[PDB]
Amino acid sequence: MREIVHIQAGQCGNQIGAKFWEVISDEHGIDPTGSYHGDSDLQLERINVYYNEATGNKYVPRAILVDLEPGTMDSVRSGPFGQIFRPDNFVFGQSGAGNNWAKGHYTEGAELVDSVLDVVRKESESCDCLQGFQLTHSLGGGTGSGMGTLLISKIREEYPDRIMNTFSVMPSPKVSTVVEPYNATLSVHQLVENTDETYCIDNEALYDICFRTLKLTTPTYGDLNHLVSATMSGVTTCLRFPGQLNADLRKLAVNMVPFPRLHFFMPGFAPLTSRGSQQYRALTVPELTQQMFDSKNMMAACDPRHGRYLTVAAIFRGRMSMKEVDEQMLNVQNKNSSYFVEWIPNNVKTAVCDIPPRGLKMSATFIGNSTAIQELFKRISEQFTAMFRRKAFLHWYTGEGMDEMEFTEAESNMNDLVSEYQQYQDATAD
Amino acid sequence: RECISIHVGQAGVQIGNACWELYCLEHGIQPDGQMPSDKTIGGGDDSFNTFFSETGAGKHVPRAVFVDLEPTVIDEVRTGTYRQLFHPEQLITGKEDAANNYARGHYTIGKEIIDLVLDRIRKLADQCTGLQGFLVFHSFGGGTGSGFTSLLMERLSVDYGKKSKLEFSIYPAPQVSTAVVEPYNSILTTHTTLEHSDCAFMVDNEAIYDICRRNLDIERPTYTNLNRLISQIVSSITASLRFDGALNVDLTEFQTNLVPYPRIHFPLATYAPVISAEEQLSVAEITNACFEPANQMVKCDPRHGKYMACCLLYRGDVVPKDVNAAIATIKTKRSIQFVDWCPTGFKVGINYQPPTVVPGGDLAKVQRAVCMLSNTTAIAEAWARLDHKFDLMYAKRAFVHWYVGEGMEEGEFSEAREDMAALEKDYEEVGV
Amino acid sequence: PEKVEMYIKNLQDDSPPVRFNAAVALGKIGDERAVEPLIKALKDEDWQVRKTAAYALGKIGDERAVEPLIKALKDEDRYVRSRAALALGKIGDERAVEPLIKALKDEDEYVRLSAASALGKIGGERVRAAMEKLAETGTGFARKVAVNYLETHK
Ligand SMILES: Nc1nc2c(ncn2[C@@H]2O[C@H](COP(=O)(O)OP(=O)(O)OP(=O)(O)O)[C@@H](O)[C@H]2O)c(=O)[nH]1
Ligand SMILES: Nc1nc2c(ncn2[C@@H]2O[C@H](COP(=O)(O)OP(=O)(O)O)[C@@H](O)[C@H]2O)c(=O)[nH]1
Ligand SMILES: [Mg+2]
């Protein structure tokens, strides 16, 4: 369990994926040419997780950049850290998926998928001991949704003993494309069956944090991705720096996933700021710990107080008292006892990393498996029902090879998932 | 990049030459096909080549085909003012007509001519770099309009799969009514064409007769009077496809925007201003008039239904701010009920080319005009009228023996009515 | 002559269909006085005014229009880009050869075609040289247009 293979699909996948590399490359002390120009020994300790060592002492990301739209190829390559990526690892079509899931999962996507698998096989070969896979994509579009979930299924039949982890960004009417609930319902059906750990990044919550908390009147995707990049930086901290707590993908999955299907995590970050917001008043351990479960700091549009936490992983970053952290994590559980499942002893795990993120003296990242995530799936189900009830625009999908049963199967699975969440929220130790 | 127009039977053929008269006038084309520097429209960029091929001479020829099982109606095209415009192979005629019998136009007599027609379309399709599809004109009530159109629609689906087929249908009226059995022919064509058409624009002969009497003051309107009006509305619908405009450019943009459920593809078109040449209307006035049942192509009450789509196509002296202001009042002031799952969005198109009227026609030249396309549940009222008339005669099996004796099975009547029942239920259920 | 002054002041007018009708008129008549006002209408707020000013500038032919039309191949509107490309083809100035070659890699089919047609209408020696280089070091549609031009020209 050493190397992680990263795959980024579609518009959303490549944009949020690129910001992740720009962020962790700075954290690991890598410039856009792949040369290490840092100071800490800790920076290169677990560098082999996300990078390959080539040339002299040059580091290359173990990243595969996919899209059916070739436009994305130039966007990322001409970008800030576009020169670190392997040129043979860009797999781009000339076609496009026109926001149709069936186009990415059956027609246009199924043609390019084997050329992608050729590249995944290439990177899996120069892997001493592969941990697993990490996919960044959007569930609202066509490529990231359809092709991305085809990739997930195709990888899982070839590499089943490897962990499949995803960063799935949820579509929202606030942000965006009428058949987004179809693309999101059809992808959630694949994720419930083919991933081990999924981070539910909701565009509704992303907009709301910018709008309500950050006071950004009409935010761009650059403002939303500023929350996504900082979240991804914190949730992958455990894997990137030397430690004991959730050191690898499987160890994290073992602690966070009590039930096969209940593997969708409500991500969170503290403190929250706007891009280039001239920093003022550094946070303390109690202020960090309080912003923990604070609904206003969640990246998924759910209230934690509307459900119970099955399991929790908390990551504190910077120079701070371990006794302060341990004291504040115990109070947050005793002063919120009812919101933590009684039948799962020691469900909250804490980790402290001495390395803080870029621009922040101290930060705190939170990964929660709360039964309250059913609120997100209910919202997609309602949006889906209204359209599928009348069988509206169904022919755009069914025309591209798909069957109506596939819509009924995805709807059944997503309704079942919500009922499962509720069954454990209502479950007592007695 | 290209569209083929098929004109079937008396109604379709007669409407076709009224359409083509207006298209020529709109794009600055003479009845011989010549487009000289004095008569050329002027303002560069022209996309009329979707409907007119260009000969080596500089002659613009309609990408049109005219079919009738009797020669009478097409003979008038061949001797008319536009005798020069169309090529002889485009105009196809039989000897014996379908005698207002669907089974003659679909089976017996229709089967004789179907193959030639297809090769004549093939001659046109072979002159297209990227054929988008077909525009089919026909009546519901004539044996050829009903029977041959459904037979051709069936064959075009096999011979041209991924090609759009948009219809312009002559819905019957008791006023201009040459047959008792028109309800039978109407239900039969709609049943067999439903799975083959992508979109269908009905023209209710009763509505145009009512519009001519009310708006144009014609005492007893003739086919000449109705047709000049039909072609005005039709031109406004097809303008998107012939001009360098942003809304409903190709046949796919038309389907995508207007039809969300496949079976429910009958948009109701309205048109304002319809003035007699005997006083200037603003953008607010003409937009408002689109939401008035009096100005509709088909008789129905939109206040009793739900919308799935709503497009406003303006032409002439129409300013962007005025259109936005007019739309804004219609959103806040009117009781326009849309279905839940679809957004309350009015797709707007503006072409600044002045309206072109028929010289010697009953219509006055206006500064601005508007053609609204609404996909409403209210169009089930048009189906209900027809279905009831059908049921009255069918229960006693009247006139049915004429159909069964012309290569048809009586069960096709029951099968047809069953499809109409389902179509009526679909409009009802979709509008909850 | 007496009416040319009128439409030049209608090109300035508040009303967008009036501005459109002024640009249609000045292309239909085509006077050297209308060059600079139609050059200003290439930067109009409305696409229907910009595209018809571009068509007018190509018909009239005046060399002063070559520069604003080169910038018009980069217009956000697909119809404006196609009309500007075709106008440059009508004028036939060799300064347009390279911007028209860059338009061969446009997202719109009509624009790509209009750029190909324009290049063929100019057909000097600099066009030929650029076609020779593009036929060997070129890709897809842009390569087909170089290869088709050199085969239509023995
Ligand atoms: N508005 C309009 N309706 C017409 C016209 N000609 C016929 N109709 C109507 O169409 C129906 C009759 O069908 P037709 O088109 O004449 O018949 P056909 O397709 O030639 O078929 P056969 O009569 O069997 O040869 C009636 O409702 C007529 O009133 C016309 O030029 N315009
Ligand atoms: N937060 C975020 N959401 C995005 C981004 N790009 C697109 N989206 C969302 O993803 C959905 C559209 O999917 P997209 O990636 O563009 O399409 P694809 O290339 O076909 O997968 C919508 O819900 C958009 O709001 C991005 O950069 N950030
Ligand atoms: Mg007849």
mmCIF file with all atom_site columns, C-alpha atoms and ligand atoms in Angstrom, chain B residues 8-15 67-70 73 96-102 104-105 138-149 170-179 182 185 203-205 208 222-227 230, ligand 1:
data_model
loop_
_atom_site.group_PDB
_atom_site.id
_atom_site.type_symbol
_atom_site.label_atom_id
_atom_site.label_alt_id
_atom_site.label_comp_id
_atom_site.label_asym_id
_atom_site.label_entity_id
_atom_site.label_seq_id
_atom_site.pdbx_PDB_ins_code
_atom_site.Cartn_x
_atom_site.Cartn_y
_atom_site.Cartn_z
_atom_site.occupancy
_atom_site.B_iso_or_equiv
_atom_site.pdbx_formal_charge
_atom_site.auth_seq_id
_atom_site.auth_comp_id
_atom_site.auth_asym_id
_atom_site.auth_atom_id
_atom_site.pdbx_PDB_model_num
ATOM   1  C CA  . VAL B 1 8   ? -49.142 15.867 -50.606 1.00 0.00 ? 8   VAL B CA  1
ATOM   2  C CA  . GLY B 1 9   ? -52.688 16.106 -52.055 1.00 0.00 ? 9   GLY B CA  1
ATOM   3  C CA  . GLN B 1 10  ? -54.855 19.132 -52.924 1.00 0.00 ? 10  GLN B CA  1
ATOM   4  C CA  . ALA B 1 11  ? -54.440 21.031 -49.601 1.00 0.00 ? 11  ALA B CA  1
ATOM   5  C CA  . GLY B 1 12  ? -50.672 20.375 -49.320 1.00 0.00 ? 12  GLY B CA  1
ATOM   6  C CA  . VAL B 1 13  ? -49.961 21.198 -52.995 1.00 0.00 ? 13  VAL B CA  1
ATOM   7  C CA  . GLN B 1 14  ? -52.109 24.396 -52.968 1.00 0.00 ? 14  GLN B CA  1
ATOM   8  C CA  . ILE B 1 15  ? -50.514 25.516 -49.646 1.00 0.00 ? 15  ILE B CA  1
ATOM   9  C CA  . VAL B 1 67  ? -47.502 14.705 -55.093 1.00 0.00 ? 67  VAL B CA  1
ATOM   10 C CA  . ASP B 1 68  ? -51.200 14.056 -56.026 1.00 0.00 ? 68  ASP B CA  1
ATOM   11 C CA  . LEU B 1 69  ? -53.033 10.888 -57.160 1.00 0.00 ? 69  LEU B CA  1
ATOM   12 C CA  . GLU B 1 70  ? -55.040 13.052 -59.678 1.00 0.00 ? 70  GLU B CA  1
ATOM   13 C CA  . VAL B 1 73  ? -54.185 20.525 -58.727 1.00 0.00 ? 73  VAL B CA  1
ATOM   14 C CA  . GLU B 1 96  ? -57.352 8.036  -60.317 1.00 0.00 ? 96  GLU B CA  1
ATOM   15 C CA  . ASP B 1 97  ? -57.468 9.891  -56.950 1.00 0.00 ? 97  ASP B CA  1
ATOM   16 C CA  . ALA B 1 98  ? -58.069 8.379  -53.467 1.00 0.00 ? 98  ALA B CA  1
ATOM   17 C CA  . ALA B 1 99  ? -61.807 9.521  -53.471 1.00 0.00 ? 99  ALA B CA  1
ATOM   18 C CA  . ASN B 1 100 ? -61.617 10.804 -49.785 1.00 0.00 ? 100 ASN B CA  1
ATOM   19 C CA  . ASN B 1 101 ? -60.705 7.194  -48.770 1.00 0.00 ? 101 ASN B CA  1
ATOM   20 C CA  . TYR B 1 102 ? -57.601 6.658  -46.553 1.00 0.00 ? 102 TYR B CA  1
ATOM   21 C CA  . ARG B 1 104 ? -56.996 4.089  -51.406 1.00 0.00 ? 104 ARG B CA  1
ATOM   22 C CA  . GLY B 1 105 ? -54.229 6.622  -50.609 1.00 0.00 ? 105 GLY B CA  1
ATOM   23 C CA  . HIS B 1 138 ? -51.043 17.550 -46.346 1.00 0.00 ? 138 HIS B CA  1
ATOM   24 C CA  . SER B 1 139 ? -54.708 17.400 -45.239 1.00 0.00 ? 139 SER B CA  1
ATOM   25 C CA  . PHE B 1 140 ? -56.157 14.992 -42.671 1.00 0.00 ? 140 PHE B CA  1
ATOM   26 C CA  . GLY B 1 141 ? -59.465 14.548 -44.572 1.00 0.00 ? 141 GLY B CA  1
ATOM   27 C CA  . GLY B 1 142 ? -58.453 13.784 -48.155 1.00 0.00 ? 142 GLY B CA  1
ATOM   28 C CA  . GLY B 1 143 ? -57.665 10.197 -49.117 1.00 0.00 ? 143 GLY B CA  1
ATOM   29 C CA  . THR B 1 144 ? -54.209 11.205 -50.493 1.00 0.00 ? 144 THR B CA  1
ATOM   30 C CA  . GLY B 1 145 ? -53.497 13.798 -47.756 1.00 0.00 ? 145 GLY B CA  1
ATOM   31 C CA  . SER B 1 146 ? -54.184 11.147 -45.083 1.00 0.00 ? 146 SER B CA  1
ATOM   32 C CA  . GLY B 1 147 ? -53.350 7.819  -46.778 1.00 0.00 ? 147 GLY B CA  1
ATOM   33 C CA  . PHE B 1 148 ? -50.370 8.668  -48.958 1.00 0.00 ? 148 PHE B CA  1
ATOM   34 C CA  . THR B 1 149 ? -48.683 10.892 -46.319 1.00 0.00 ? 149 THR B CA  1
ATOM   35 C CA  . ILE B 1 170 ? -54.864 20.530 -42.618 1.00 0.00 ? 170 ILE B CA  1
ATOM   36 C CA  . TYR B 1 171 ? -57.201 19.753 -39.725 1.00 0.00 ? 171 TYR B CA  1
ATOM   37 C CA  . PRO B 1 172 ? -60.835 19.487 -41.101 1.00 0.00 ? 172 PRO B CA  1
ATOM   38 C CA  . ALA B 1 173 ? -63.768 21.976 -40.665 1.00 0.00 ? 173 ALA B CA  1
ATOM   39 C CA  . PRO B 1 174 ? -67.545 21.570 -41.512 1.00 0.00 ? 174 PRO B CA  1
ATOM   40 C CA  . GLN B 1 175 ? -67.262 24.859 -43.562 1.00 0.00 ? 175 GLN B CA  1
ATOM   41 C CA  . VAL B 1 176 ? -64.594 23.845 -46.133 1.00 0.00 ? 176 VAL B CA  1
ATOM   42 C CA  . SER B 1 177 ? -65.565 20.117 -45.966 1.00 0.00 ? 177 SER B CA  1
ATOM   43 C CA  . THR B 1 178 ? -65.632 18.046 -49.090 1.00 0.00 ? 178 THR B CA  1
ATOM   44 C CA  . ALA B 1 179 ? -66.221 14.662 -47.146 1.00 0.00 ? 179 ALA B CA  1
ATOM   45 C CA  . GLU B 1 182 ? -62.834 13.136 -42.836 1.00 0.00 ? 182 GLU B CA  1
ATOM   46 C CA  . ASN B 1 185 ? -59.152 9.661  -42.342 1.00 0.00 ? 185 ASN B CA  1
ATOM   47 C CA  . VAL B 1 203 ? -54.029 24.192 -39.213 1.00 0.00 ? 203 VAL B CA  1
ATOM   48 C CA  . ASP B 1 204 ? -57.671 23.982 -38.203 1.00 0.00 ? 204 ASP B CA  1
ATOM   49 C CA  . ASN B 1 205 ? -59.726 25.054 -41.237 1.00 0.00 ? 205 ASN B CA  1
ATOM   50 C CA  . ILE B 1 208 ? -58.601 30.222 -40.403 1.00 0.00 ? 208 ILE B CA  1
ATOM   51 C CA  . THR B 1 222 ? -62.627 30.634 -50.234 1.00 0.00 ? 222 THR B CA  1
ATOM   52 C CA  . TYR B 1 223 ? -59.539 28.308 -50.416 1.00 0.00 ? 223 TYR B CA  1
ATOM   53 C CA  . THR B 1 224 ? -57.604 31.308 -51.941 1.00 0.00 ? 224 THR B CA  1
ATOM   54 C CA  . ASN B 1 225 ? -58.345 33.495 -48.845 1.00 0.00 ? 225 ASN B CA  1
ATOM   55 C CA  . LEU B 1 226 ? -57.431 30.752 -46.277 1.00 0.00 ? 226 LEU B CA  1
ATOM   56 C CA  . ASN B 1 227 ? -54.190 29.790 -48.129 1.00 0.00 ? 227 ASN B CA  1
ATOM   57 C CA  . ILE B 1 230 ? -51.862 29.741 -43.859 1.00 0.00 ? 230 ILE B CA  1
HETATM 58 N N1  . LIG D 2 .   ? -57.017 25.383 -46.240 1.00 0.00 ? 1   LIG D N1  1
HETATM 59 C C1  . LIG D 2 .   ? -57.105 24.511 -47.249 1.00 0.00 ? 1   LIG D C1  1
HETATM 60 N N2  . LIG D 2 .   ? -57.843 23.413 -47.097 1.00 0.00 ? 1   LIG D N2  1
HETATM 61 C C2  . LIG D 2 .   ? -58.027 22.734 -48.245 1.00 0.00 ? 1   LIG D C2  1
HETATM 62 C C3  . LIG D 2 .   ? -57.545 23.041 -49.499 1.00 0.00 ? 1   LIG D C3  1
HETATM 63 N N3  . LIG D 2 .   ? -57.935 22.076 -50.414 1.00 0.00 ? 1   LIG D N3  1
HETATM 64 C C4  . LIG D 2 .   ? -58.628 21.218 -49.703 1.00 0.00 ? 1   LIG D C4  1
HETATM 65 N N4  . LIG D 2 .   ? -58.714 21.547 -48.378 1.00 0.00 ? 1   LIG D N4  1
HETATM 66 C C5  . LIG D 2 .   ? -59.353 20.751 -47.298 1.00 0.00 ? 1   LIG D C5  1
HETATM 67 O O1  . LIG D 2 .   ? -58.756 19.465 -47.239 1.00 0.00 ? 1   LIG D O1  1
HETATM 68 C C6  . LIG D 2 .   ? -59.779 18.462 -47.040 1.00 0.00 ? 1   LIG D C6  1
HETATM 69 C C7  . LIG D 2 .   ? -59.935 17.631 -48.288 1.00 0.00 ? 1   LIG D C7  1
HETATM 70 O O2  . LIG D 2 .   ? -58.693 16.947 -48.530 1.00 0.00 ? 1   LIG D O2  1
HETATM 71 P P1  . LIG D 2 .   ? -57.799 17.154 -49.843 1.00 0.00 ? 1   LIG D P1  1
HETATM 72 O O3  . LIG D 2 .   ? -56.447 17.727 -49.642 1.00 0.00 ? 1   LIG D O3  1
HETATM 73 O O4  . LIG D 2 .   ? -58.561 18.035 -50.831 1.00 0.00 ? 1   LIG D O4  1
HETATM 74 O O5  . LIG D 2 .   ? -57.679 15.742 -50.570 1.00 0.00 ? 1   LIG D O5  1
HETATM 75 P P2  . LIG D 2 .   ? -56.534 14.992 -51.381 1.00 0.00 ? 1   LIG D P2  1
HETATM 76 O O6  . LIG D 2 .   ? -55.305 14.943 -50.553 1.00 0.00 ? 1   LIG D O6  1
HETATM 77 O O7  . LIG D 2 .   ? -56.290 15.676 -52.725 1.00 0.00 ? 1   LIG D O7  1
HETATM 78 O O8  . LIG D 2 .   ? -57.134 13.536 -51.633 1.00 0.00 ? 1   LIG D O8  1
HETATM 79 P P3  . LIG D 2 .   ? -58.269 12.954 -52.590 1.00 0.00 ? 1   LIG D P3  1
HETATM 80 O O9  . LIG D 2 .   ? -59.424 13.953 -52.519 1.00 0.00 ? 1   LIG D O9  1
HETATM 81 O O10 . LIG D 2 .   ? -58.695 11.587 -52.149 1.00 0.00 ? 1   LIG D O10 1
HETATM 82 O O11 . LIG D 2 .   ? -57.667 12.996 -53.991 1.00 0.00 ? 1   LIG D O11 1
HETATM 83 C C8  . LIG D 2 .   ? -61.020 19.254 -46.664 1.00 0.00 ? 1   LIG D C8  1
HETATM 84 O O12 . LIG D 2 .   ? -60.947 19.535 -45.274 1.00 0.00 ? 1   LIG D O12 1
HETATM 85 C C9  . LIG D 2 .   ? -60.840 20.506 -47.511 1.00 0.00 ? 1   LIG D C9  1
HETATM 86 O O13 . LIG D 2 .   ? -61.575 21.624 -47.044 1.00 0.00 ? 1   LIG D O13 1
HETATM 87 C C10 . LIG D 2 .   ? -56.704 24.221 -49.637 1.00 0.00 ? 1   LIG D C10 1
HETATM 88 O O14 . LIG D 2 .   ? -56.118 24.620 -50.645 1.00 0.00 ? 1   LIG D O14 1
HETATM 89 N N5  . LIG D 2 .   ? -56.541 24.881 -48.439 1.00 0.00 ? 1   LIG D N5  1
#
